Amino acid sequence: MKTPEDCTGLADIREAIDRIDLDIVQALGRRMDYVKAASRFEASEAAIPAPERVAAMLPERARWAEENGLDAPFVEGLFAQIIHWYIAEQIKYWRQT
Amino acid sequence: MKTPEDCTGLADIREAIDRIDLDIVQALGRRMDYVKAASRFIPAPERVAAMLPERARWAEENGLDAPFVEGLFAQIIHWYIAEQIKYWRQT
Numbered sequence A: 001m002k003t004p005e006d007c008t009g010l011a012d013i014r015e016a017i018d019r020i021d022l023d024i025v026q027a028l029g030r031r032m033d034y035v036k037a038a039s040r041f042e043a044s045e046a047a048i049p050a051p052e053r054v055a056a057m058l059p060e061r062a063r064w065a066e067e068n069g070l071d072a073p074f075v076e077g078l079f080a081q082i083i084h085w086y087i088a089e090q091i092k093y094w095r096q097t
Numbered sequence B: 001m002k003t004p005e006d007c008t009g010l011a012d013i014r015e016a017i018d019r020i021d022l023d024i025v026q027a028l029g030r031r032m033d034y035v036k037a038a039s040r041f042i043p044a045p046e047r048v049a050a051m052l053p054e055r056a057r058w059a060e061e062n063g064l065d066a067p068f069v070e071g072l073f074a075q076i077i078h079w080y081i082a083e084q085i086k087y088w089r090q091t
């Protein structure tokens, strides 16, 4: 995997983009492992959506986006979506267990 | 970070989830560098069309719902295409 400035054409660019997208998928898959592990440390079902934790999480991700040359609303939006889905998945996991 | 099974409480879980979320942001930041580098070689229709099912498959292989993951990548790919177009027009 070449650095962007050493990419010689679109084959190199795409190999690197494929690797980075797969890394993101694999990281989301590991993230689910952690979210499911959380379910045993939840006092109750009402504990799941942990609103102070989520409330703080999104602006922190918006800050990381700004520190990584990305538009904050785009990245904060993506994480709102991921967090929503993972909460729903945790609630599903907690209910079926 | 501890593995999920070795996490002892929500402190451990959160530390690991924050480090993973930071990893994803950092990776998206690197991804932009590649999309901007590509500009000199735009919506590349056949490329997008093939990429999405590939990401759906990776999702299935990592125990995530494919529609949710494919939907995220559809959004990511649209945003980056626009940013590549912006970069190409601005330069």
Ligand SMILES: O=C(O)c1ccccc1O
Residues within 6 Å of the ligand: A035, A048, A049, A050, A053, A054, A082, A083, A084, A086, A087, A090, B017
């Ligand atoms: O996905 C998360 O990071 C999350 C945050 C707070 C509560 C439940 C969750 O799944």
Ligand SMILES: O=C(O)c1ccccc1O
Residues within 6 Å of the ligand: A017, B035, B042, B043, B044, B047, B048, B076, B077, B080, B081, B082, B084
């Ligand atoms: O983000 C992408 O993966 C992409 C793919 C094809 C063309 C332009 C792009 O930004």
